[PDB]
Amino acid sequence: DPATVFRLVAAEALTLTGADGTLVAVPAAAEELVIVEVAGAVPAEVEASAIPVQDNAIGQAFRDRAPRRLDVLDGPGLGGPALVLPLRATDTVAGVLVAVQGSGARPFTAEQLEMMTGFADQAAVAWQLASSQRRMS
Numbered sequence: 001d002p003a004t005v006f007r008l009v010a011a012e013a014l015t016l017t018g019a020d021g022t023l024v025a026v027p028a029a030a031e032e033l034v035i036v037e038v039a040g041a042v043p044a045e046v047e048a049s050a051i052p053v054q055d056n057a058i059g060q061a062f063r064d065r066a067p068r069r070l071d072v073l074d075g076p077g078l079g080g081p082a083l084v085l086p087l088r089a090t091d092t093v094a095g096v097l098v099a100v101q102g103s104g105a106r107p108f109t110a111e112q113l114e115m116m117t118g119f120a121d122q123a124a125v126a127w128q129l130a131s132s133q134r135r136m137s
Contacts, residue, residue: 002130003036009087009097009123010037016119017112019099020078024087025051025058026095033062033096035076042100046076061086061096067117069108079103083113085120089128097123 006024013022021042025033028050035049053059058076061068061084073082080101087094097120099108 002127002134005123005127005130006037006095009127010039013085013097013099013116013119014039017083017099017108017116019083020080020102020105021100023076023098023100024095025062025098027062027093030062033059036095041078041102042076049076051076057082057084058096058098062093065093067113067120069110069113071107072103073098073100076100080105081107083108083116085116087120087124087127089124092128094124094127 010022010024021040023035023042024037025035028034031053033051033053035046038044038046051058053062057070057073065086065088068084070082078100080103083099085097087097
């Protein structure tokens with residue numbers, strides 16, 4: 001199941017960043033994303049949460065395909081710094097990976113943003129491959 005890629009993405013991103021939590025939001029043009037995977041300090045109960053595409057950093061990344069570091073991200077963020085990482089495949093964004101810190105954590109560095117951008121690119125390739133393997137079966 002390609003969706004299983006997203007579980008691994010959330011888990012590996014937690015490990016690589018050491019952030020309090022992670023989440024992956026995926027389209028169910030889309031008007032909404034759905035949180036299919038959470039890890040760390042993001043409560044399990046947040047899974048299946050619907051996020052609007054418009055008017056927030058996560059939905060914006062889904063549209064503009066621009067990796068971004070933030071000093072503050074509120075719900076579904078934890079109030080502190082975040083990395084917003086679109087999972088950019090060739091003609092489609094598979095979803096958005098978000099690494100989240102609680103308030104008063106140090107901001108993410110440019111190097112961390114660069115590292116996780118490459119991770120997020122590699123992740124979308126993995127997902128695009130899984131999607132294609134499924135489609136021809």
